[PDB]
């Protein structure tokens, strides 16, 4: 038996009575809005790895400031809100609140796991850290 | 509260009463029509085959319901599972017909 | 009419279908993950998993 | 022939089931095997009145 990966690897006796096909109910709420609507539900969220490294070493994501990109993240999370019941503008929004939320923060590609900046990369400082020693050949 | 355990290896498949006791498909049971109306199609695959040449004798509680009639001449044969099976199946949850 | 099996009243059609059936409830004859099945619409639902390429009826 | 690994051949009072595991791993062990079953999920679902 074989089984396939979902991910990317390493390397005329009787006829009894009483069964029929007429199908007189119908759905009282509707079997396949609710199939519809338990669609969306179902969906596990999505993560995020900003800051997290990866095989490499260093952090992957965007380069922008930390509230920076909190703030223009619940931009685009309420643009996305406005698309689902089509409106111009959307209703529950997420940015514009009458809160002042000024001391939030979110994850990005400005920081490393150290705690130093990532305007250059892990790999490209390992590699520079083992090549300021080196020596040759007479 | 009613639950149908199915029959394995010759045994009759039984039913649970108010009282928790297992009865077989057979005698003189009593329904509300409701509990009819909410299973109407996993009871007819039970029960249909034992009303017809069995021994199971059922009184719907129903209080009120519309009739109709049918008359037939007692010179000749006469059966009315044609008429009883359709009525039978045609139970709904939401309506039941004449 | 296709003809039934008795344990979960569904409607089963070929003598192949009905014994891949029955080994759902544990008896040997002679794939999906979840089975479910009404009793007063004739409508099962069952659930397939998400890579698989037809859903012809399938969750 | 390493006889500290073939241990259940070659020791004449040793229970089929003595592993020496910490000191020296060993080939030839007794394995059980198995051939179970995954059935789907399934419910027959009724209303109540
Ligand atoms: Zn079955």
């Not at chain 1, 990532?118 to 490209?124: V, Y």
């Not at chain 4, 910490?22 to 679902?45: C, F, G, K, M, S």
Request: aromatic content about 8%; some cysteine; overall charge negative.
């Amino acid at each position: 038996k074989r089984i396939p990966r979902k991910t990317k690897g390493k390397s005329p006796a009787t006829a009894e009575p009483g069964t029929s096909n007429c199908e007189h109910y119908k759905a009282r709420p509707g079997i396949a809005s609710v199939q519809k609507a338990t669609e969306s539900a179902e969906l596990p969220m999505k993560n995020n790895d900003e800051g997290t490294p990866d095989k490499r070493g260093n952090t992957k994501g965007a380069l922008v400031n930390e509230h920076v990109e909190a703030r223009d993240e619940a931009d685009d999370a309420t643009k996305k809100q406005a698309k689902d019941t089509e409106k111009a503008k959307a209703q529950v929004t997420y940015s514009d609140t009458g809160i002042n939320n000024a001391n939030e923060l979110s994850r990005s590609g400005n920081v490393d796991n150290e705690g130093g900046s990532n305007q250059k990369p892990m790999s490209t400082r390992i590699a520079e850290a083992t090549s300021a020693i080196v020596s040759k050949h007479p | 509260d009613c639950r149908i355990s199915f029959g394995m290896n010759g045994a009759a498949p039984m039913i649970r009463d108010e009282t928790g006791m297992m009865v077989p498909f057979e005698g003189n049971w009593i329904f509300p029509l409701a509990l009819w109306q909410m299973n109407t199609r996993y009871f007819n695959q039970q029960f249909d085959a034992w009303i017809k040449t069995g021994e199971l004798r059922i009184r719907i509680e129903m209080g009120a319901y519309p009739y109709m009639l049918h008359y037939y001449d007692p010179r000749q044969y006469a059966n009315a599972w044609n008429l009883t099976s359709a009525w039978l199946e045609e139970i709904t949850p939401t309506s039941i017909p004449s | 009419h296709g003809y039934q099996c008795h344990v979960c009243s569904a409607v089963l059609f070929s003598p192949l279908d009905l014994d891949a059936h029955v080994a759902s409830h544990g008896l040997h004859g002679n794939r999906h993950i979840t089975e479910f099945i009404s009793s007063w619409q004739n409508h099962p639902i069952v659930q397939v998993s998400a890579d698989v390429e037809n859903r012809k009826t399938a969750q | 022939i390493p006889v500290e690994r073939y241990n259940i051949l070659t020791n004449p009072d040793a229970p089929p089931t003595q592993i020496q595991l910490p000191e020296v791993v060993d080939l030839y062990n007794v394995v059980t095997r198995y051939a179970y079953e995954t059935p789907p999920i399934t419910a027959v679902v009724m209303g109540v009145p």
